[model samples]
Target: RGEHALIGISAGNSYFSQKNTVMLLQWAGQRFERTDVVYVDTHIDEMLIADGRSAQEAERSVKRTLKDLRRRLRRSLESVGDHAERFRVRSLSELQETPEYRAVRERTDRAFEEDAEFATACEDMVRAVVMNRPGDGVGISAEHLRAGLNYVLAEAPLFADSPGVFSVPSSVLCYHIDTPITAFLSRREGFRAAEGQAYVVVRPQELADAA
Candidate 1:
């Protein structure tokens, strides 16, 4: 994996899913590569009445829309050099049920600290991991890591109060480190927590090699 990138999108304030992601990726063409789509389920079940369509009918229509979109993408991109491998679909529940996930979440809740420096350092460590920096991983546990990340998200000037809400067309690349990474890292068994808020424990040798 060259650069593992996760792309998440919400179709306005409405129901967004893998179907929306596939449509966008296919429409955008070569602008993106090696991207995986993760659908963050908001668990908001609201009725939609569009153009005289009943709530049930509207929901069915949306599901159909997503299905058709996927079928079209598979047919269109299947011949254009294995593009299917670049995309994926995942749900929030499936992600959170993992043991690592539970561990990190528990750790974050326990280590609810109000330290800015600690939070910044944690964010920097995550950035290093994302950027694949050398010797950039050490002395961090899954619990503390998540706690630090949550601290940043809750306290950072850009995403505090509402980390889920993101601005569109904004040049600033503010990472939703808490949600996506937490979901992703939680799937890995090696990413464990020890004492305190240690969300991720980086192996020293692995860190040196990555460095």
Candidate 2:
């Protein structure tokens, strides 16, 4: 299919930890010709600080998460015998600075304020994250959820936004459970990227065979 997978991960989701990186990579390698493992590190520390962790502690926690993810990803690719060149590590911090992301963010921010269904979807995403991961989302607010949801929404346009890395008409496979962001994207128009780009949300369990 010449598909390019955008496998996203962050601090909150326990399912996207070191234990599953290998399995996830194996699954993606078998399917997509290329994969970009995007670590959404924009506002996770804020949620931790809001949850009462000290500033230094929150920073340390976020750093540790990123370090572990990269380390495991390195080992996963090696163990799976997949070519390291086939994958690349991307971060939201880098993507956010791009013009493409900025434009989409503006639209999403507007939706956050005016669109009832989009706002509700983001809220439901927040609740779902808090519910699924006990104690992780202790003090995460609706604003925090909005940041996360917005990042997820950005994943769909990653390939189209970048001029390099897989110049072909690309597709995304955001590996996570179904969230309201997924729902909102499905029902709404004008949110997705150009015509050739396709986005699909994938659950971790669907590739459990890699375990």
Candidate 3:
């Protein structure tokens, strides 16, 4: 296929381990002409501070993780051999500049106000985020839940963005789990990715070496 693939990796998602990165690249290389690894960095430092890290510590942590991310992604791309030129890495903040992002976010904001089911779904996602953090005192609240909605909306833009680069006949957006926002944006009849696009929940894997 001449389509493209967008692989999502949020800052704190443990599912995005080195093993999974390798498998994801292999899977995308086989199916799509090119692929992009989109690193979701929205609110990463703020979220770390919320977990009780000092501002300096949080900044260092973000820097260190991103450094490892850059090295790991380059190595993973190299491991894929011939298709190295077909892969690219980008940050979520870069996508925010697109008008499509603003347009999609506005719709999401309206949905948060008008859709009861979707709002509850968003809260549930927020609950999972809080529970999964590596801390003892993180708690959930309306404001926290609202921030989660914003996080999801930030990535939701990818579903609608087709600026010259991704303006192909078909594209697949990949993530490890299907959150409320992804469900709403990708599946709803009138929402983002409504045509010639697909949203897939996938966990790339590699078999054990000694088994």
Candidate 4:
């Protein structure tokens, strides 16, 4: 897959398949039923790179970022009409303060430290980007710190009996540009391929309609 990491949406949508459509719908399909939909807002220490930026700049970015995320959420809620009041809104800061979140955070942090193969890869990536331009104001690496906070943070609510649908939002664009999709997918179901780029040599087949 010799594709740009940030390819245009048009080119990406030019080619699609049954599997891709299924995956996207699943991402978009969260419950709109009468349940508490808590939105987790990651801590500044966990989600932001306030390392060397002027305090004013970080504040401005988040100010706009917060508005955009809420706006996205509110629009969908609006579609619910009168039932919108049944759903709840909350932040990650509140969740993090709970004992359950504390437990999950520590667990993920430890696993990230212990997973040698992945840890090494993450470290290599962090250094590679940093060395390419030393002291370019990217004071700290994000994935190194919050690589998969959502991985554990998502499940933490179950233990506290506050369990409902949860989704976290990040600034559409961080004032500090350090975004990484670093995660473990090889162990997940049906993710493996024959060596690499099997799709280039193989053609996708059409799927049947569900009855």
Candidate 5:
């Protein structure tokens, strides 16, 4: 039998989204033997990169900041004697790099090539992005990226039950990096407005059921 629990971690007006997320996961992992962590990317960072920011520049300026915050979080976790392996970090980009993502991207591309309607194209684009293939249909062009994001916004609810419970930190929430937004918007609409946050959690059972 399987049981589920939801733990909402909000910085609550604090500038610690990134650090908090990492620290909370590490803490949970150490305290609860059955706990698992999953992070959902909204592509806010990638959007920044797509908007003419160099990957290196973005990583250095934006990614590095989050890394620094996580570094502090890691130290705190370690102070409590939590081992590194107690938690897992899964980003959207990392998820797309998986074999499953490749198949989804190919399928989305074929769908778009078959019939080119704004809706269909958008759907294909959403699938591509979800599969981490922003370059598949329109090659990651700004216009295509927007369309893909729209599609994701429209279609995400069809699969809304996929994600799991997890908390995000404040630095990550407030960072101006753009790439992560793309990943986030492709999954659900009104998410940012409703939650006032960007990242998400993937439920393990949802993944299994989707498969």
Candidate 6:
């Protein structure tokens, strides 16, 4: 939380960038002589529409998903050194397999659900909708919207994973376009991405300060 993080997984299985990684390289090898890599293992946030009430299943699912995703990253990287050396790729979520990370995460979860109280706070904030907008903005109130969403961001990442736009050094940009997260950023943080039917832009929030 002290420094910037490169990626944040939105809702689960959210981005359909199944071919994005592949497409980038294929296009890159043809156009550019050199290539770069930053293979991020994705994560799933617990500050979500969770799986189990106590928040166990959702947490476990995040680890299980990331473990498998790391294997895939290895495979992808293997094809990449036509790409880089060891220092080139920066990773997270893989670190999550350890007990130390899990243990700390459990404590954070408890505080949010009880003492800090975001579980219900987000629930109520998410439910509130603002019906007024002269900018032809989305119907929801941007004020409450950013507070609730960014609060989740401030706490432990419910699900953490790779960034789309900022995922690799070579990527052009990635963002979740269709959601309130994007709209909130433009209004509050001064970042604006193109609009589309896209669900989540592929970039991470911490890296969103970029163009």
TM-score of each: 0.32, 0.70, 0.75, 0.42, 0.37, 0.38
Q: Please write out the lDDT profile of model 1 over residues 54-129, one tens digit for every residue.
A: 5676577556645554454455446443556655544434545645345445444444355444344446644433
Tens digit of per-residue lDDT, candidate 2, span 29-138: 77887777777776766556556678899789889877876676667668766476777776878867766567656666666678776666555555554444324545
Candidate 3 displacement at residue 172 in angstroms? 1.7
- Model 1 misplacement above 4 A: 11-34, 46-81, 111-211
Off by over 4 Å in 2: 17-19, 132-168, 178-211
lDDT of 3 by residue, 1-211 (tens): 6488888777667766777777777777777787877887676676666666788997898888888777877777777767677787788887667565566667656775787765555556566655565445567655555556567656645654433335556678776654433444433233333366677667443222211
What tens-digit string does per-residue lDDT give for candidate 5 at 1-211?
1122222211111323444444444434433443333233334445446556676775564565455544654564465454655444444445456564454455444444563443343555454553453222233575446634743542332122222112221111212122333343454331222121233343334333443
What are the runs in model 6 whose C-alpha is more than 4 Å off? Answer: 1-18, 25-45, 48-55, 92-173, 179-181, 188-211
Give, for candidate 1, the lowest lDDT window spanning 10 residues: 158-167
Which residue runs does candidate 3 get wrong by more than 4 Å?
Answer: 134-138, 159-165, 177-193, 203-211
Worst ten-residue run, lDDT, model 6?
190-199
lDDT of 5: 0.39
lDDT of 1 at 104: 46
TM-score ranking from best candidate downward? 3, 2, 4, 6, 5, 1
> 1 or 4, which is superior by lDDT?
1
Displacement of the residue 177 alpha carbon in candidate 3, Å: 4.7
Each model's backbone clash number: 14, 0, 0, 1, 28, 22
Highest TM-score model number: 3
Better of 1 and 6 by TM-score: 6
Q: For candidate 6, lDDT tens digit of each residue in 1-211?
A: 1111223323232342334444433443444333334333332332322211234664565566666655655555456546434213334344445454465456545555674344544344333312211123343444435534444433232222112222222222233455433333333222222221122244333223331
lDDT of 4 by residue, 107-126 (tens): 54564467565444444543
Q: On a 0 to 100 scale, what is the lDDT of residue 85 in model 3?
A: 78
Q: Per-model C-alpha lDDT, please?
A: 0.36, 0.61, 0.65, 0.34, 0.39, 0.36
What TM-score does candidate 6 reach? 0.38
